[PDB]
Design a protein around this ligand. Structure first.
Ligand SMILES: FC(F)(F)c1n[nH]cc1-c1ccccc1
Length: 468
């Protein structure tokens, strides 16, 4: 008999899995919310600020109405190369933001030392991608990399239809801190990373007023062979593609239909993405430069790392946020940790979710969220930034690992406003002026210099309907 080859690998469940890390795809955990788990690992945070900064050049009339299509194509071209590097070095891409990719190498404690060496090598090879690269002279199409290692907690929260996950704890905080010390082309190790690493492998230098260190060189011992060392490390990599599947970038490409598994995984993925996955919408429909309102919610806790207290608090906040967003077809685009705080990137006006009065509604939603979350047990401070304007939306990353992402100056502005004006609801000038709401519902705020924003415009606090 003939033996025709090729397994079919283009099933909905495989397409859904592209949008999720192995941490979730192979997680098999309780559908109970919140769910927390604890493990150890090495984290890599790749700052792709330099790439995502391209949204405003692709806004030019020079792109003739194909700015979004050109932006997604060039971003995915460069980001795909980073993703392939991470995946081939055995890492799990946890999440994309419109500023960073976070990857994880989960291993037992005994293996942290050797896995840091693998992760450092990967980091140097990522820098290597961009060594002789730029567009229109453009100073830096380069990245900055922070590495951390140690204890990691995972939180999964959500309701019967949607799930979100976050990683939290000191290593997560550390990787953020390490990456923001980095200059372009740097690899910064967290203090704990540097304490756990194989010091014979590397030459480092001090970072002033910091215990974190910069990798100058990976200079292995004389008889060292990276390929034989990496092979030994794969013993500890549960899902590293191997044998008949050594030609695949992800074991997840081999997932077969499994309705119980697909029911679980689809909860993490936006319905408009599932529509495309199901071939019920054109594959190009979600790449767009779209006017939206960003509502960026930051929740601060007394404790940053103890998942046991913050997990219920985030779950409670989530149940409220999702009810409020439902009314106006808002979506949670991303949730992540930023310096102790849990941040929800909410978007009003995603594709096929157009509202007329997006602005009064976004403000009213923000205040509702603010008021409810302020009364949630263990939430110390709620801060919300509301900014409106044109943002790029699109599925960003590699064919085998990508996520829908929103990128733009207005996203960065809402993010900065919630950090620089903590404990209040703030909005930009577009939102304030567009709402037509009486001027006394607002307070005009002092101008603050915010890292990464060049002239925010007048900013306002949404004070609300009453003096009280
Ligand atoms: F992966 C999570 F869950 F999204 C996360 N948890 N903590 C930080 C992050 C994060 C990830 C990517 C960019 C920025 C932050």
């Amino acid at each position: 008999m003939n033996t025709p080859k090729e397994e079919f690998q283009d099933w909905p469940i495989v397409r859904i899995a592209a949008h999720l890390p192995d941490l979730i795809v192979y997680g098999h955990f309780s559908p109970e919310r919140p769910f927390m788990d604890y493990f150890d690992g090495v984290l890599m945070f790749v700052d792709i600020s330099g790439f995502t900064a391209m949204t405003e050049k692709f806004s030019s009339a020079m792109y003739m109405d194909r700015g979004a299509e050109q932006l997604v194509e060039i971003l995915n071209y460069h980001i795909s190369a980073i993703v392939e590097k991470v995946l081939i070095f055995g890492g799990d891409i946890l999440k994309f933001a419109g500023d960073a990719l976070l990857a994880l190498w989960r291993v037992e404690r005994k293996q942290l030392k050797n896995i840091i060496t693998v992760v450092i090598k990967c980091s140097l090879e990522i820098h290597g991608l961009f060594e002789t690269q730029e567009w229109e002279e453009g100073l830096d199409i380069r990245v900055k990399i922070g590495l951390a290692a140690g204890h990691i907690s995972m939180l999964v929260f959500g309701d019967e239809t949607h799930s979100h996950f976050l990683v939290i704890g000191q290593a997560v905080d550390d990787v953020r801190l390490a990456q923001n010390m980095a200059q372009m082309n740097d690899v910064i190790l967290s203090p704990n990373c540097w304490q756990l690493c194989d010091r014979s492998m590397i030459e480092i230098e001090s970072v002033p007023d910091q215990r974190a260190v910069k990798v100058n060189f990976l200079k292995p011992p004389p008889n060292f062979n990276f390929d034989e060392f990496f092979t030994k490390c794969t013993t500890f990599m549960h899902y590293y593609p191997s044998g008949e599947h050594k030609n695949l970038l992800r074991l997840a490409c081999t997932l077969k239909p499994d309705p119980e598994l697909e029911m679980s995984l689809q909860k993490y993925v936006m319905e408009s993405i599932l529509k495309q996955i199901d071939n019920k919408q054109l594959q190009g429909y979600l790449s767009e430069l779209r006017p939206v309102t960003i509502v960026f919610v930051n929740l601060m806790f007394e404790d940053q790392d103890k998942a046991e207290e913050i997990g219920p608090a985030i779950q409670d906040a989530y149940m409220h946020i999702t009810s409020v967003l439902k009314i106006f077809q808002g979506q949670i685009n991303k949730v992540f940790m930023f310096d102790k705080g849990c941040s929800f990137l909410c978007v009003f006006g995603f594709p096929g979710e157009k509202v007329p009065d997006e602005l009064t509604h976004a403000l009213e939603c923000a205040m509702d969220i603010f008021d409810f979350c302020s009364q949630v047990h263990k939430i110390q401070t709620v801060s919300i930034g509301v900014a409106s304007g044109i943002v790029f939306c699109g599925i960003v990353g590699h064919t085998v690992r990508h996520e829908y992402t929103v990128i733009g100056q207005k996203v960065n502005l809402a993010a900065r406003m919630m950090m620089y004006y903590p404990g209040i609801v703030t909005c930009d000038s577009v939102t304030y002026n567009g709402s037509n709401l009486p001027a006394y519902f607002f307070k005009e705020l002092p101008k603050k210099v915010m890292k990464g924003v060049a002239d925010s415009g007048p900013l306002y606090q949404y004070w609300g309907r009453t003096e009280k």
